[PDB]
Amino acid sequence: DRINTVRGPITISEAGFTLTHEHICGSSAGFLRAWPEFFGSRAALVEKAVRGLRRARAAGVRTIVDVSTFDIGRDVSLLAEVSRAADVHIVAATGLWEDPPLSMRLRSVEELTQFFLREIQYGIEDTGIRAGIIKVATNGKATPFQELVLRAAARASLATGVPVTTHTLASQRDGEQQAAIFESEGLSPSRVCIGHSDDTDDLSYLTALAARGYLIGLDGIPHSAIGLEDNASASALLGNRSWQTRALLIKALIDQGYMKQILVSNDWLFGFSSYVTNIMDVMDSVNPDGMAFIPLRVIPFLREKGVSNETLAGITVTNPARFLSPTLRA
Amino acid sequence: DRINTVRGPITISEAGFTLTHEHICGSSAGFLRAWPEFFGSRAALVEKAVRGLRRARAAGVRTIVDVSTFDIGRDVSLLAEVSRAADVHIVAATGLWEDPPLSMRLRSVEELTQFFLREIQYGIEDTGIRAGIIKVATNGKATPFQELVLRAAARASLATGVPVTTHTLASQRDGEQQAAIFESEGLSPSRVCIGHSDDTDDLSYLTALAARGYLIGLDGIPHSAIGLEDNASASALLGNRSWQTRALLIKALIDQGYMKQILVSNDWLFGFSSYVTNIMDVMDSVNPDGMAFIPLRVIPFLREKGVSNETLAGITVTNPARFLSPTLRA
Numbered sequence: 022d023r024i025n026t027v028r029g030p031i032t033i034s035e036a037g038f039t040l041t042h043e044h045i046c047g048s049s050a051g052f053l054r055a056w057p058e059f060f061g062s063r064a065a066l067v068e069k070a071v072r073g074l075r076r077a078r079a080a081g082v083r084t085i086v087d088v089s090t091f092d093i094g095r096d097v098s099l100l101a102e103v104s105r106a107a108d109v110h111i112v113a114a115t116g117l118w119e120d121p122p123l124s125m126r127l128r129s130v131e132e133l134t135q136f137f138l139r140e141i142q143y144g145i146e147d148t149g150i151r152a153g154i155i156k157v158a159t160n161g162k163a164t165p166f167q168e169l170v171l172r173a174a175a176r177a178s179l180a181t182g183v184p185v186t187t188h189t190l191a192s193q194r195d196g197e198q199q200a201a202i203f204e205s206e207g208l209s210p211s212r213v214c215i216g217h218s219d220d221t222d223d224l225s226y227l228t229a230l231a232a233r234g235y236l237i238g239l240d241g242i243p244h245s246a247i248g249l250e251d252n253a254s255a256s257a258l259l260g261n262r263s264w265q266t267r268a269l270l271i272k273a274l275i276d277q278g279y280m281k282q283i284l285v286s287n288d289w290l291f292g293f294s295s296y297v298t299n300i301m302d303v304m305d306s307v308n309p310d311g312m313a314f315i316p317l318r319v320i321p322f323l324r325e326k327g328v329s330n331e332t333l334a335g336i337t338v339t340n341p342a343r344f345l346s347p348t349l350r351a
Numbered sequence: 352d353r354i355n356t357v358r359g360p361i362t363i364s365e366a367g368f369t370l371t372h373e374h375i376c377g378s379s380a381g382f383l384r385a386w387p388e389f390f391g392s393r394a395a396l397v398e399k400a401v402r403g404l405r406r407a408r409a410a411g412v413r414t415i416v417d418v419s420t421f422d423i424g425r426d427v428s429l430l431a432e433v434s435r436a437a438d439v440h441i442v443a444a445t446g447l448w449e450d451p452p453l454s455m456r457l458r459s460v461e462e463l464t465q466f467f468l469r470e471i472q473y474g475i476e477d478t479g480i481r482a483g484i485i486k487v488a489t490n491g492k493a494t495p496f497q498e499l500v501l502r503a504a505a506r507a508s509l510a511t512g513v514p515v516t517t518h519t520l521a522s523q524r525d526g527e528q529q530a531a532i533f534e535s536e537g538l539s540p541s542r543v544c545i546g547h548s549d550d551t552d553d554l555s556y557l558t559a560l561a562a563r564g565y566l567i568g569l570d571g572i573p574h575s576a577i578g579l580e581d582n583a584s585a586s587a588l589l590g591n592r593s594w595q596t597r598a599l600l601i602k603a604l605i606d607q608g609y610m611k612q613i614l615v616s617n618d619w620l621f622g623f624s625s626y627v628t629n630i631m632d633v634m635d636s637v638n639p640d641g642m643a644f645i646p647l648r649v650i651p652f653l654r655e656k657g658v659s660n661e662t663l664a665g666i667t668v669t670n671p672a673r674f675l676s677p678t679l680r681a
């Protein structure tokens with residue numbers, strides 16, 4: 022049993038402490054190549070990511086899942102360089118997020134399945150690097166094209182055993198429609214993580230997903246604009262619920278019997294061109310720990326609130342390995 | 352005086368017979384790298400383009416202006432390879448078309464100007480290849496972002512002397528708003544071609560642009576779905592006006608005194624991923640001459656209708672050189 026990373030297959034035991042929803046860079050296809058000065062320089066972005074991943078590794082992280090798709094401007098050569106330099110495994114993604122270009126938006130469910138399978142089974146671009154996860158997205162009711170993407174993701178997962186992870190507008194309970202479409206294609210919920218689920222406090226929605234077997238992505242714990250005075254763009258992005266409020270959803274699901282279905286992450290980035298200029302600076306001021314926020318702050322917080330070390334080890338080590346290890350029914 | 356091509360600067364005399372609105376490939380940023388099998392293979396696309404450009408050269412073409420932007424998936428390395436193999440100069444474009452990703456759509460007018468200037472003055476990606484034209488787009492009333500793109504294009508042209516060429520929804524008379532925005536930034540109409548202008552028969556609109564000094568892009572002459580039975584997608588793309596009807600607009604503008612302001616092209620492509628699957632096959636059935644259609648069919652047609660050889664030489668050689676040669680007022 023092996024998980025594909027940007028430096029090759031690794032064993033399940035090698036994955037270790039794993040952050041399941043992260044980004045080296047949140048961008049757009051071709052953007053880093055065409056306009057590296059937007060990030061200062063490509064080298065500056067690399068250096069920032071390596072420093073961040075090294076600090077995460079010192080805090081105990083061993084693997085991150087970079088859920089950047091084609092249309093987030095995923096650059097697997099960049100991921101490989103940062104992964105080598107920081108000694109942190111990086112799992113790359115296929116799929117499509119919320120900004121597909123026309124050349125993707127016009128494609129059929131069969132064509133999309135071919136593209137996702139290409140990136141899982143053959144390689145990404147000419148790199149030979151294979152994706153270990155499929156990323157999809159809705160923001161409210163699925164567009165007709167997003168329905169095709171979700172179905173193609175299910176077909177690619179059914180052929181390969183690679184899991185699916187989703188972006189939702191959690192306030193619209195998107196996981197319900199995503200589940201319906203996935204299940205219509207015959208995909209096991211055990212192969213699916215419904216992400217950005219910490220954006221909502223609706224326990225009925227969260228437990229309805231977990232009851233049918235879905236993994237719950239509580240993946241934006243440090244995202245908060247509390248204490249940011251009069252920054253409309255940061256408030257729209259990050260919300261005004263505290264990181265403690267988000268983190269307590271981890272305890273809530275544990276207390277309901279779902280500890281094996283919880284996946285926790287920061288949804289951090291080291292560059293961020295697909296939003297307003299200087300958002301990365303704002304985010305780094307909110308959370309200077311970056312990707313180390315989960316082990317340095319969330320884990321001790323949950324221990325203080327009575328969650329055991331063993332349970333948190335299961336959530337951060339056992340659950341990601343069970344999720345990522347290719348299979349049709351985990 | 353020199354015009355930048357994908358193989359370096361050329362003199363005005365070297366440009367020769369020039370098609371001012373063409374594409375090697377109409378695609379999306381990063382798409383050819385990530386999914387070359389969509390085109391059969393990258394090599395198959397290269398071979399098809401080289402054969403087409405060789406046939407165009409045999410018909411008299413010496414230069415094409417590839418008006419593919421970043422978001423049309425412009426690959427200047429591909430353009431250079433095809434240009435070398437076919438012995439046809441290719442001018443590359445900067446700017447943005449109708450499918451910018453989030454990382455572009457969130458940018459300011461100043462940021463966009465920096466990006467356009469980068470591609471004109473420094474190089475595209477890491478290739479050192481510099482754009483010789485700026486391409487912009489509206490489809491009806493400009494979106495707020497498209498207003499910024501048009502202003503940034505004007506600023507980049509004012510700094511460099513490189514011309515601007517536009518995509519319009521001609522039925523909505525977009526050239527009127529485009530002109531208004533360009534002029535508000537102080538750009539000379541002599542540096543601007545309002546493209547897809549052969550999509551309309553409205554002489555009041557066309558002469559209103561030409562009267563204030565704009566160049567008129569009659570650039571889709573072979574685009575027609577006449578005789579295509581019950582193909583809705585091809586009819587939506589190509590329209591149901593004949594190529595003869597489009598070509599007679601060249602004569603119409605000559606007869607009104609605007610021969611020096613007419614630019615003629617095919618708006619052909621050798622691959623086309625940003626529309627429905629197999630559209631390239633449909634288009635090649637409509638116009639097997641491809642980019643050779645203008646010299647092989649339109650020029651003799653206009654001669655038969657009484658246009659002189661000298662006038663057509665002025666339109667196909669003199670006007671493109673005057674347009675492309677960098678200057679603030681041509």
Ligand SMILES: *[C@H]1CC[C@@](C)(CC)CC1
Nearest residue numbers: 275327328329331332333
């Ligand atoms: C991990 C161990 C199980 C509890 C204590 C719930 C019984 C939660 C922490």
Ligand SMILES: *[C@H]1CC[C@@](C)(CC)CC1
Nearest residue numbers: 605657658659661662663
């Ligand atoms: C080019 C020469 C001028 C005419 C004949 C109009 C007088 C048009 C063709």
Ligand SMILES: [Zn+2]
Nearest residue numbers: 187188189217
């Ligand atoms: Zn997301």
Ligand SMILES: [Zn+2]
Nearest residue numbers: 042044088288
């Ligand atoms: Zn994310």
Ligand SMILES: [Zn+2]
Nearest residue numbers: 517518519547
């Ligand atoms: Zn166009």
Ligand SMILES: [Zn+2]
Nearest residue numbers: 372374418618
């Ligand atoms: Zn075009």
